[PDB]
Design an enzyme around this catalytic site. Structure first.
Site, PDB file in Angstrom:
ATOM      1  N   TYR A 117     -29.560  39.194  22.591  1.00  0.00           N
ATOM      2  CA  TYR A 117     -28.400  38.305  22.435  1.00  0.00           C
ATOM      3  C   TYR A 117     -27.068  39.022  22.188  1.00  0.00           C
ATOM      4  O   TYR A 117     -27.010  40.034  21.489  1.00  0.00           O
ATOM      5  CB  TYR A 117     -28.581  37.379  21.228  1.00  0.00           C
ATOM      6  CG  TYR A 117     -29.724  36.405  21.303  1.00  0.00           C
ATOM      7  CD1 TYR A 117     -31.046  36.832  21.177  1.00  0.00           C
ATOM      8  CD2 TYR A 117     -29.483  35.050  21.500  1.00  0.00           C
ATOM      9  CE1 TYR A 117     -32.100  35.927  21.248  1.00  0.00           C
ATOM     10  CE2 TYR A 117     -30.528  34.141  21.575  1.00  0.00           C
ATOM     11  CZ  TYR A 117     -31.833  34.589  21.451  1.00  0.00           C
ATOM     12  OH  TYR A 117     -32.867  33.701  21.570  1.00  0.00           O
ATOM     13  N   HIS A 125     -24.561  33.447  22.572  1.00  0.00           N
ATOM     14  CA  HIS A 125     -24.754  33.490  24.021  1.00  0.00           C
ATOM     15  C   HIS A 125     -26.220  33.275  24.405  1.00  0.00           C
ATOM     16  O   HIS A 125     -27.107  33.280  23.546  1.00  0.00           O
ATOM     17  CB  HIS A 125     -24.273  34.836  24.584  1.00  0.00           C
ATOM     18  CG  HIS A 125     -22.805  35.087  24.411  1.00  0.00           C
ATOM     19  ND1 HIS A 125     -22.209  36.279  24.768  1.00  0.00           N
ATOM     20  CD2 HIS A 125     -21.812  34.305  23.923  1.00  0.00           C
ATOM     21  CE1 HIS A 125     -20.915  36.219  24.507  1.00  0.00           C
ATOM     22  NE2 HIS A 125     -20.649  35.031  23.994  1.00  0.00           N
ATOM     23  N   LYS A 156     -33.716  32.635  33.126  1.00  0.00           N
ATOM     24  CA  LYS A 156     -32.778  33.454  32.368  1.00  0.00           C
ATOM     25  C   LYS A 156     -32.704  34.803  33.071  1.00  0.00           C
ATOM     26  O   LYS A 156     -33.180  34.940  34.199  1.00  0.00           O
ATOM     27  CB  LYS A 156     -33.255  33.618  30.925  1.00  0.00           C
ATOM     28  CG  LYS A 156     -33.190  32.329  30.131  1.00  0.00           C
ATOM     29  CD  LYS A 156     -33.673  32.505  28.710  1.00  0.00           C
ATOM     30  CE  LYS A 156     -33.418  31.239  27.907  1.00  0.00           C
ATOM     31  NZ  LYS A 156     -34.063  31.288  26.570  1.00  0.00           N
TER      32      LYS A 156
END
Ligand SMILES: [Cl-]
Ligand SMILES: [Cl-]
Lengths: 180, 160
Positions: A117, A125, A156
Protein backbone atom coordinates in the site's frame (compact mmCIF):
# COMPACT_ATOMS: atom_id res chain seq x y z
CA UNK A 1 9.36 -2.59 22.64
CA UNK A 2 9.89 -6.22 23.57
CA UNK A 3 8.46 -9.29 21.87
CA UNK A 4 8.50 -13.01 22.55
CA UNK A 5 9.47 -15.56 19.96
CA UNK A 6 6.99 -18.41 20.01
CA UNK A 7 7.66 -20.90 17.22
CA UNK A 8 7.59 -19.13 13.85
CA UNK A 9 5.89 -15.99 15.17
CA UNK A 10 6.49 -13.13 17.60
CA UNK A 11 4.07 -12.25 20.39
CA UNK A 12 3.59 -8.70 21.68
CA UNK A 13 1.90 -9.14 25.08
CA UNK A 14 1.85 -5.49 26.20
CA UNK A 15 -1.12 -3.62 24.65
CA UNK A 16 0.57 -0.20 24.73
CA UNK A 17 3.63 -1.63 22.98
CA UNK A 18 1.26 -3.44 20.64
CA UNK A 19 -0.75 -0.34 19.70
CA UNK A 20 2.50 1.59 19.21
CA UNK A 21 4.17 -1.01 16.98
CA UNK A 22 0.96 -1.12 14.95
CA UNK A 23 0.69 2.65 14.77
CA UNK A 24 4.26 2.83 13.45
CA UNK A 25 3.07 1.55 10.09
CA UNK A 26 0.48 -1.21 10.28
CA UNK A 27 2.70 -4.04 11.49
CA UNK A 28 1.34 -7.35 12.74
CA UNK A 29 -2.24 -8.43 13.35
CA UNK A 30 -4.13 -8.35 16.66
CA UNK A 31 -5.56 -11.65 17.92
CA UNK A 32 -9.29 -11.99 17.23
CA UNK A 33 -9.61 -8.97 14.92
CA UNK A 34 -8.88 -9.16 11.21
CA UNK A 35 -7.64 -5.68 10.40
CA UNK A 36 -8.10 -2.72 12.81
CA UNK A 37 -9.00 0.64 11.26
CA UNK A 38 -6.84 2.29 13.94
CA UNK A 39 -4.50 1.02 16.66
CA UNK A 40 -7.16 2.57 18.86
CA UNK A 41 -9.38 -0.50 18.47
CA UNK A 42 -6.65 -3.01 19.40
CA UNK A 43 -7.14 -4.75 22.76
CA UNK A 44 -5.48 -8.08 22.13
CA UNK A 45 -1.82 -9.04 21.85
CA UNK A 46 -0.20 -7.94 18.62
CA UNK A 47 1.09 -10.83 16.54
CA UNK A 48 4.09 -10.27 14.28
CA UNK A 49 5.45 -12.68 11.70
CA UNK A 50 9.16 -13.47 11.65
CA UNK A 51 9.50 -11.36 8.50
CA UNK A 52 8.02 -8.35 10.31
CA UNK A 53 9.88 -9.01 13.55
CA UNK A 54 13.25 -9.42 11.86
CA UNK A 55 12.63 -6.14 10.01
CA UNK A 56 11.68 -4.21 13.16
CA UNK A 57 14.65 -5.61 15.05
CA UNK A 58 16.98 -4.50 12.26
CA UNK A 59 15.27 -1.11 12.41
CA UNK A 60 16.10 -0.92 16.11
CA UNK A 61 12.41 -0.42 16.82
CA UNK A 62 12.10 -3.79 18.56
CA UNK A 63 13.88 -6.24 20.85
CA UNK A 64 13.09 -9.93 20.78
CA UNK A 65 13.35 -12.63 23.41
CA UNK A 66 12.87 -16.39 23.39
CA UNK A 67 12.39 -17.60 26.95
CA UNK A 68 15.26 -15.68 28.49
CA UNK A 69 17.50 -15.73 25.43
CA UNK A 70 17.89 -12.40 23.65
CA UNK A 71 17.78 -13.05 19.90
CA UNK A 72 19.48 -10.45 17.72
CA UNK A 73 19.12 -9.91 13.96
CA UNK A 74 21.64 -12.59 12.91
CA UNK A 75 19.91 -15.21 15.06
CA UNK A 76 16.36 -14.18 14.20
CA UNK A 77 17.16 -14.09 10.50
CA UNK A 78 18.64 -17.57 10.77
CA UNK A 79 15.51 -18.77 12.56
CA UNK A 80 13.41 -17.35 9.75
CA UNK A 81 15.44 -19.37 7.25
CA UNK A 82 14.79 -22.54 9.24
CA UNK A 83 11.11 -21.93 10.09
CA UNK A 84 9.75 -20.04 7.08
CA UNK A 85 9.91 -21.44 3.50
CA UNK A 86 11.22 -18.85 1.01
CA UNK A 87 12.22 -16.68 3.96
CA UNK A 88 15.23 -15.23 2.13
CA UNK A 89 13.35 -14.04 -0.92
CA UNK A 90 10.32 -13.04 1.15
CA UNK A 91 12.32 -10.92 3.59
CA UNK A 92 14.26 -9.38 0.71
CA UNK A 93 11.09 -8.05 -0.92
CA UNK A 94 9.44 -7.21 2.40
CA UNK A 95 12.44 -5.16 3.49
CA UNK A 96 13.08 -3.51 0.12
CA UNK A 97 9.47 -2.49 -0.22
CA UNK A 98 9.23 -1.44 3.39
CA UNK A 99 12.50 0.49 3.12
CA UNK A 100 11.03 2.30 0.12
CA UNK A 101 8.16 3.54 2.25
CA UNK A 102 5.31 1.24 1.24
CA UNK A 103 3.11 -0.34 3.90
CA UNK A 104 3.47 -4.09 3.39
CA UNK A 105 0.82 -6.53 4.56
CA UNK A 106 0.14 -10.22 3.98
CA UNK A 107 -1.22 -10.87 0.52
CA UNK A 108 -2.43 -14.43 1.07
CA UNK A 109 -6.15 -13.53 1.16
CA UNK A 110 -5.51 -12.46 -2.42
CA UNK A 111 -3.29 -15.39 -3.34
CA UNK A 112 0.02 -13.54 -3.21
CA UNK A 113 2.85 -12.96 -0.75
CA UNK A 114 2.23 -9.30 -0.04
CA UNK A 115 -0.42 -6.60 -0.25
CA UNK A 116 1.57 -3.40 -0.76
CA UNK A 117 0.00 0.00 0.00
CA UNK A 118 0.96 3.64 -0.65
CA UNK A 119 -0.26 5.77 2.27
CA UNK A 120 0.27 9.18 3.81
CA UNK A 121 -1.33 11.92 5.93
CA UNK A 122 -4.97 11.28 5.11
CA UNK A 123 -4.18 9.17 2.03
CA UNK A 124 -5.14 5.56 1.33
CA UNK A 125 -4.61 3.73 -1.97
CA UNK A 126 -5.55 0.42 -3.61
CA UNK A 127 -3.29 -2.58 -2.71
CA UNK A 128 -0.62 -3.80 -5.10
CA UNK A 129 -0.18 -7.56 -4.91
CA UNK A 130 3.37 -8.84 -4.96
CA UNK A 131 4.76 -12.34 -5.27
CA UNK A 132 8.40 -12.75 -4.30
CA UNK A 133 10.58 -14.96 -6.48
CA UNK A 134 14.10 -16.33 -6.66
CA UNK A 135 15.44 -15.09 -10.00
CA UNK A 136 16.75 -18.57 -10.74
CA UNK A 137 13.80 -20.69 -9.61
CA UNK A 138 12.21 -22.36 -12.65
CA UNK A 139 8.53 -21.46 -13.00
CA UNK A 140 6.11 -23.78 -14.81
CA UNK A 141 3.33 -22.77 -17.19
CA UNK A 142 0.82 -24.10 -14.70
CA UNK A 143 2.22 -21.82 -12.00
CA UNK A 144 2.50 -18.89 -14.40
CA UNK A 145 -1.11 -19.58 -15.37
CA UNK A 146 -1.94 -19.68 -11.65
CA UNK A 147 -0.31 -16.25 -11.39
CA UNK A 148 -2.47 -14.57 -14.02
CA UNK A 149 -5.43 -16.17 -12.23
CA UNK A 150 -4.93 -14.43 -8.89
CA UNK A 151 -4.36 -11.27 -10.92
CA UNK A 152 -7.68 -10.76 -12.70
CA UNK A 153 -9.46 -12.21 -9.66
CA UNK A 154 -9.59 -9.05 -7.54
CA UNK A 155 -8.51 -7.25 -10.70
CA UNK A 156 -5.66 -5.49 -8.90
CA UNK A 157 -2.00 -5.14 -9.84
CA UNK A 158 -0.01 -8.40 -9.74
CA UNK A 159 3.77 -8.02 -9.47
CA UNK A 160 6.74 -10.41 -9.33
CA UNK A 161 9.51 -9.51 -6.93
CA UNK A 162 12.60 -11.23 -8.30
CA UNK A 163 15.44 -11.26 -5.79
CA UNK A 164 19.14 -11.96 -6.26
CA UNK A 165 20.31 -13.46 -2.98
CA UNK A 166 23.89 -12.55 -3.86
CA UNK A 167 23.89 -8.78 -4.44
CA UNK A 168 20.49 -8.32 -2.81
CA UNK A 169 19.23 -6.37 -5.83
CA UNK A 170 15.58 -6.66 -6.87
CA UNK A 171 13.86 -6.69 -10.27
CA UNK A 172 10.14 -6.04 -10.29
CA UNK A 173 8.12 -7.35 -13.21
CA UNK A 174 4.38 -6.95 -13.43
CA UNK A 175 2.06 -8.93 -15.68
CA UNK A 176 -1.58 -8.87 -16.69
CA UNK A 177 -3.89 -11.53 -18.08
CA UNK A 178 -4.45 -10.30 -21.65
CA UNK A 179 -7.45 -10.75 -23.93
CA UNK A 180 -5.83 -10.65 -27.38
CA UNK B 1 -1.31 -19.45 -55.70
CA UNK B 2 1.10 -22.37 -55.76
CA UNK B 3 4.19 -22.88 -53.64
CA UNK B 4 6.99 -25.43 -53.53
CA UNK B 5 8.06 -27.15 -50.35
CA UNK B 6 11.84 -27.16 -50.15
CA UNK B 7 13.04 -28.56 -46.82
CA UNK B 8 11.55 -26.57 -43.95
CA UNK B 9 10.44 -23.64 -46.10
CA UNK B 10 8.10 -22.84 -48.98
CA UNK B 11 9.25 -21.20 -52.20
CA UNK B 12 7.01 -18.89 -54.26
CA UNK B 13 8.69 -18.75 -57.69
CA UNK B 14 6.09 -16.67 -59.56
CA UNK B 15 6.59 -12.95 -58.86
CA UNK B 16 2.94 -12.01 -59.42
CA UNK B 17 1.81 -14.73 -57.01
CA UNK B 18 4.59 -13.59 -54.70
CA UNK B 19 3.57 -9.91 -54.69
CA UNK B 20 -0.05 -10.95 -54.19
CA UNK B 21 0.62 -13.29 -51.25
CA UNK B 22 2.71 -10.52 -49.71
CA UNK B 23 0.06 -7.87 -50.38
CA UNK B 24 -2.54 -10.05 -48.64
CA UNK B 25 -1.04 -9.19 -45.27
CA UNK B 26 2.76 -9.09 -45.23
CA UNK B 27 3.46 -12.81 -45.50
CA UNK B 28 6.90 -14.20 -46.22
CA UNK B 29 10.14 -12.44 -47.04
CA UNK B 30 11.58 -11.80 -50.53
CA UNK B 31 15.22 -12.70 -51.18
CA UNK B 32 16.22 -9.08 -51.74
CA UNK B 33 12.15 -12.02 -56.49
CA UNK B 34 10.98 -15.30 -55.01
CA UNK B 35 8.84 -15.01 -51.89
CA UNK B 36 9.95 -17.35 -49.12
CA UNK B 37 7.34 -18.64 -46.67
CA UNK B 38 8.00 -20.62 -43.51
CA UNK B 39 6.04 -23.79 -42.86
CA UNK B 40 4.07 -21.93 -40.20
CA UNK B 41 2.98 -19.31 -42.74
CA UNK B 42 2.46 -21.85 -45.51
CA UNK B 43 0.33 -24.16 -43.39
CA UNK B 44 -1.77 -21.15 -42.36
CA UNK B 45 -2.32 -19.90 -45.92
CA UNK B 46 -3.18 -23.41 -47.10
CA UNK B 47 -5.76 -23.76 -44.35
CA UNK B 48 -7.07 -20.32 -45.40
CA UNK B 49 -7.51 -21.63 -48.94
CA UNK B 50 -5.32 -18.81 -50.17
CA UNK B 51 -2.53 -21.17 -51.20
CA UNK B 52 -1.78 -24.57 -52.71
CA UNK B 53 1.44 -26.40 -51.97
CA UNK B 54 3.43 -28.94 -53.96
CA UNK B 55 6.50 -31.03 -53.22
CA UNK B 56 7.95 -32.29 -56.49
CA UNK B 57 4.70 -33.46 -58.02
CA UNK B 58 3.00 -34.42 -54.77
CA UNK B 59 0.17 -32.14 -53.69
CA UNK B 60 0.46 -31.62 -49.92
CA UNK B 61 -2.75 -30.66 -48.14
CA UNK B 62 -3.16 -29.21 -44.63
CA UNK B 63 -2.98 -32.53 -42.77
CA UNK B 64 0.26 -33.48 -44.52
CA UNK B 65 1.85 -30.04 -44.32
CA UNK B 66 0.97 -29.71 -40.66
CA UNK B 67 2.53 -33.12 -40.02
CA UNK B 68 5.68 -32.04 -41.89
CA UNK B 69 5.84 -28.96 -39.70
CA UNK B 70 5.77 -31.18 -36.62
CA UNK B 71 8.67 -33.22 -37.99
CA UNK B 72 10.79 -30.38 -39.37
CA UNK B 73 10.13 -27.46 -37.00
CA UNK B 74 10.78 -27.68 -33.23
CA UNK B 75 7.82 -26.39 -31.16
CA UNK B 76 5.76 -26.34 -34.35
CA UNK B 77 2.52 -27.18 -32.52
CA UNK B 78 2.74 -24.34 -30.02
CA UNK B 79 4.21 -21.93 -32.60
CA UNK B 80 1.48 -22.57 -35.18
CA UNK B 81 -1.17 -22.32 -32.47
CA UNK B 82 -0.10 -18.80 -31.55
CA UNK B 83 0.63 -17.83 -35.14
CA UNK B 84 -2.82 -18.89 -36.26
CA UNK B 85 -4.71 -17.52 -33.25
CA UNK B 86 -3.01 -14.15 -33.56
CA UNK B 87 -3.35 -14.12 -37.31
CA UNK B 88 -7.00 -15.15 -37.06
CA UNK B 89 -7.50 -12.23 -34.69
CA UNK B 90 -6.31 -9.85 -37.36
CA UNK B 91 -2.78 -9.07 -36.22
CA UNK B 92 0.05 -9.09 -38.76
CA UNK B 93 2.50 -11.68 -37.43
CA UNK B 94 6.17 -11.64 -38.39
CA UNK B 95 9.28 -13.42 -37.16
CA UNK B 96 10.46 -12.09 -33.83
CA UNK B 97 13.91 -13.64 -33.77
CA UNK B 98 15.79 -10.40 -34.50
CA UNK B 99 14.31 -9.34 -31.16
CA UNK B 100 14.88 -12.65 -29.41
CA UNK B 101 11.30 -13.87 -29.50
CA UNK B 102 9.11 -16.08 -31.66
CA UNK B 103 6.91 -13.41 -33.20
CA UNK B 104 6.73 -9.67 -33.84
CA UNK B 105 3.02 -8.94 -33.78
CA UNK B 106 1.69 -5.77 -35.41
CA UNK B 107 -1.70 -4.42 -34.41
CA UNK B 108 -3.83 -2.72 -37.04
CA UNK B 109 -5.91 -1.36 -34.21
CA UNK B 110 -5.23 1.41 -31.64
CA UNK B 111 5.79 -4.47 -32.46
CA UNK B 112 4.70 -6.67 -29.57
CA UNK B 113 7.13 -9.51 -28.96
CA UNK B 114 5.61 -12.90 -28.26
CA UNK B 115 7.16 -16.15 -27.11
CA UNK B 116 4.98 -19.23 -27.51
CA UNK B 117 4.97 -21.78 -24.72
CA UNK B 118 3.55 -25.17 -23.84
CA UNK B 119 1.59 -25.89 -20.66
CA UNK B 120 4.43 -28.19 -19.54
CA UNK B 121 7.13 -25.62 -20.20
CA UNK B 122 9.45 -24.37 -17.45
CA UNK B 123 11.00 -20.92 -17.73
CA UNK B 124 13.25 -19.37 -15.11
CA UNK B 125 12.51 -15.99 -13.60
CA UNK B 126 15.79 -14.70 -15.08
CA UNK B 127 15.12 -16.36 -18.44
CA UNK B 128 12.03 -14.16 -18.60
CA UNK B 129 13.24 -10.66 -17.71
CA UNK B 130 16.45 -12.23 -18.97
CA UNK B 131 16.08 -11.78 -22.70
CA UNK B 132 13.59 -10.69 -25.32
CA UNK B 133 13.76 -6.91 -24.97
CA UNK B 134 13.08 -6.83 -21.24
CA UNK B 135 16.00 -5.14 -19.45
CA UNK B 136 10.00 -2.91 -22.70
CA UNK B 137 7.41 -5.72 -22.89
CA UNK B 138 7.38 -9.41 -23.78
CA UNK B 139 4.08 -11.34 -24.26
CA UNK B 140 3.90 -15.00 -23.20
CA UNK B 141 1.81 -17.30 -25.38
CA UNK B 142 0.79 -20.16 -23.10
CA UNK B 143 -0.66 -23.07 -25.06
CA UNK B 144 -2.66 -26.05 -23.86
CA UNK B 145 -1.77 -28.88 -26.21
CA UNK B 146 -4.94 -30.71 -25.22
CA UNK B 147 -7.81 -28.29 -25.95
CA UNK B 148 -5.63 -26.03 -28.08
CA UNK B 149 -6.73 -22.98 -26.08
CA UNK B 150 -4.26 -20.11 -25.54
CA UNK B 151 -3.69 -17.77 -22.59
CA UNK B 152 -1.72 -14.61 -23.29
CA UNK B 153 0.08 -12.96 -20.40
CA UNK B 154 2.23 -9.87 -20.87
CA UNK B 155 4.82 -8.60 -18.43
CA UNK B 156 7.00 -5.52 -18.03
CA UNK B 157 10.24 -4.93 -16.17
CA UNK B 158 9.10 -2.61 -13.35
CA UNK B 159 11.03 0.06 -11.47
CA UNK B 160 9.32 0.05 -8.07
CL1 LIG C 1 3.93 -10.57 6.74
CL1 LIG D 1 6.60 -16.48 -39.37
Amino acid sequence: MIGELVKDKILIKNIEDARLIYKMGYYGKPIGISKPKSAEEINSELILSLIEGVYLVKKGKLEIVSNGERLDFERLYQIGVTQIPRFRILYSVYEDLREKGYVVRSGIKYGADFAVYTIGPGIEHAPYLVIALDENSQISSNEILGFGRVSHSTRKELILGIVNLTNGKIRYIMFKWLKM
